[PDB]
Amino acid sequence: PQITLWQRPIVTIKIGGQLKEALLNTGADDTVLEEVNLPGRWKPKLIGGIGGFVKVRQYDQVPIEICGHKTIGTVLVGPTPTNVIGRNLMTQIGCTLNF
Amino acid sequence: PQITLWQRPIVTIKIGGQLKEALLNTGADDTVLEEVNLPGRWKPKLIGGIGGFVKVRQYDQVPIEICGHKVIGTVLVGPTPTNVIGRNLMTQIGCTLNF
């Protein structure tokens, strides 16, 4: 786990053989991570939309461990001010908002 | 409630005598709402930081009801692509991430 929101909900992830940190972001539809080298197929994707668009590489069905939970989901790889775990992967780990 | 994340976590809020909808956004530090007229004191605040800054009006200790929970917190008022309930108010309502 139960994570309070007094601080930014940053968690440890394992992806592409690397240990990283990312923000659990219920405001984000998608997961965007930088500085990861993933194997296998990708396609370009345009995201954002303010000031222009940002182009990222979309990798589908990527194995990823998030705070100890091994799941699978789409990971967008590209420049991001902060590594973000979006709703697409929070559903996979069974993460809910509770109050 | 327990809110799953398959869809955007949009909830009903009551603010400044108006009914509105806003996104529960654990990636946002602050709450930003547009098209609300709040009474009482404010000061300008610069937020964002990509491409420049956005100036908003900061109102402190604003009464707000979020999905039935009457709380108090800072509300930033200015044009925003989507109304956002940030961590500052999610803490007030006792909202946690759980998995």
Binding site: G27, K45, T82, V84 | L23, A28, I47, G48, G49, V84
Partner: peptide, 7 residues
């Protein structure tokens, strides 16, 4: 920061 991300 502050982060509502739409494709």
């Amino acid at each position: 920061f502050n982060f509502p991300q739409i494709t």
